[PDB]
Amino acid sequence: MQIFVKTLTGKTITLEVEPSDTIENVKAKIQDKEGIPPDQQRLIFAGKQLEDGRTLSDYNIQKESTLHLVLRL
């Protein structure tokens, strides 16, 4: 399935994933495409902070859902 990630600039990234993929795995995919380190990434889905060790399925992220990406500083 595909999910999308919106960034601060407005750009949307597109990612291929499964429901069992962990938030870490998704941060890794983002690093591949954009070069942002996982330790700098904060992901958010419909108001909720996504934490490491939990799955997309645990947060009920679905086909074509859109997360938001922020950076730590």
Binding site: F45, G47, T66, L73
Partner: protein
Amino acid sequence: GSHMLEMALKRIQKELSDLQRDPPAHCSAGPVGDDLFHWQATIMGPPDSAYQGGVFFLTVHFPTDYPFKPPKIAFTTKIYHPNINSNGSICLDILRSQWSPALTVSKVLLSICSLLCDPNPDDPLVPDIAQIYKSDKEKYNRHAREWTQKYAM
């Protein structure tokens, strides 16, 4: 009852559906769980402001007669601002007397972002912070950044 809350539920659903089809850059928001009347949202510290970098969490509580009365919106994250207080209450017109059904939760969060960029020190929930904004803007921006580093990152 039935019909009142059906219309509200139809409307909340339509706003959620619109957020999924066309995600906005200024916020993200959605139901906490089962209950469509209780959402959470995030706001990003606007880039130009002293809140840049921070991620601010809010709760959204839709009344049963929504959208004819406004939602209840409150910060859960600590924020240093003249128009937002210790309990996360927000002094904003469009959440009270200026509320209109034409507004959405997304537009409200946008206006709240404007409030972080351009505070209104004449209608202050926190007079102390308001006086600092009025008579030492540099101190104000410093403390705002300090609180954003401390609570919202």
